[PDB]
């Protein structure tokens with residue numbers, strides 16, 4: 001699908017059995033999802049941006065269905081205002097920025 | 100061009116006669132650049148990032164060249180980790196997300 005940017009590029013995703021809305025973000029290195037429970041071991045990490053840093057839990061090898069496309073990779077779970085799909089998963093679904 | 104996301108989508112921008120590096124950021128509503136001197140009066144603006152809200156200076160009708168493409172629009176100046184080209188200017192250069 002070809003997504004224009006007149007508005008936030010939001011899509012529906014499936015993770016850990018729940019349905020959520022997330023932003024397709026080329027500016028985000030890794031994917032970050034709001035507080036939720038995920039299975040497995042995790043390790044703490046700090047990610048920073050506009051406003052500073054937040055502490056997140058790094059879960060590896062998580063499966064996510066992005067707009068009907070399955071993908072595997074690291075997911076950061078923490079107090080983010082919005083669910084963000086980063087480059088680590090955008091690449092897996094073959095997303096590109098065109099102009 | 101067609102930009103894959105295996106690495107940060109960085110591009111050269113030309114603003115105020117200077118060459119700078121900037122990130123094509125679909126998850127950013129506005130364009131935010133590091134401290135520098137811009138012409139005209141500014142208005143105050145509050146923007147929200149991953150770590151909270153910050154105060155920036157808004158300059159309108161600034162001429163900016165993004166990867167060789169000329170745009171003219173709003174540019175915010177403040178304490179940002181990297182120069183960010185947000186949706187306000189991406190729409191001007193006709194950028195889309197495809198997959």
Ligand SMILES: CC(C)CN(C[C@@H](O)[C@H](Cc1ccccc1)NC(=O)O[C@H]1CCOC1)S(=O)(=O)c1ccc(N)cc1
Pocket residue numbers: 025026027028029030031032047048049050081082084086122124125126127128129130131146147148149150180181183185
């Ligand atoms: C600042 C860039 C370099 C990185 N951020 C991505 C950006 O797309 C970020 C996404 C976002 C949108 C709305 C609320 C909160 C975050 N937009 C952003 O700050 O929008 C501001 C600037 C203009 O409009 C509002 S990040 O969230 O800090 C980040 C850092 C590390 C990881 N692993 C993932 C995400």
Ligand SMILES: [Cl-]
Pocket residue numbers: 094103
């Ligand atoms: Cl590829």
